[PDB]
Amino acid sequence: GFHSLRYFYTAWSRPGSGEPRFVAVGYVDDTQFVRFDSDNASPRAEPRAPWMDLVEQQDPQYWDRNTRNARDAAQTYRVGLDNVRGYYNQSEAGSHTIQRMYGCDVGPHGRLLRGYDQLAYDGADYIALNEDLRSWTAADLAAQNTRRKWEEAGYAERDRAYLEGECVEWLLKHLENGRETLLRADPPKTHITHHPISDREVTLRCWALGFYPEEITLTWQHDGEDQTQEMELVETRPDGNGAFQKWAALVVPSGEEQRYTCHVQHEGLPQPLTLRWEP
């Protein structure tokens, strides 16, 4: 049972607009709390979670300091678009993407489990900080350019400094100040629907609404036999109020609904539930 502070950067040039765009959002667990986007007048870091409406009280410069860090980040990765685009001898015509993901996994009492910093170029892994946090792995030759540059500049020492101290300390800050939102386990409202296809076939759907965090496991069983491979599993979706929804369906011979049972696993439930359909 760990918690995570994660930051997601995206810089991309698009065909019909000179000057690339930069988006920078941060998550605690499955809760977004901050954003930055350079497509604004004076682009600023802004709150996207209720407990961050209060953060100016304990840290009046948080918004100014984080606006500074993101506006600089926007600049370095717009040049990075040009650099990597040149490594691959690509032309100015195309549209390309640099993504960054960095953060930390912390255990029960301020215990750093893992730290990471990863970069993708056009959606493929480019360079990443190793788990030891003192070395990198580069994907291809063009990434070796970067790794050799970063090795020279000893940028891992600066990275591990943030990840070992600042990342941990800010996760704990956010978990305490956003207790009502972050340290919460909302079990799902589960119920099964029945939709016939023909005289002999039926679709049984197992819903799960309003659960947090996002991790969940829906499972259909037939007389205790596992039926995951015959299952139709929707991808879990947000509901707009900070929670998630998901369903699993499976097709069954009509008049035999009651031999099949849905199985729900969620952190917010006292123990997994096995469901059944009833007229």
Partner: peptide, 9 residues
């Protein structure tokens, strides 16, 4: 905080 040091690739 956003990390305060980004190195260009």
């Amino acid at each position: 905080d956003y990390i305060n040091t980004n190195l260009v690739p």
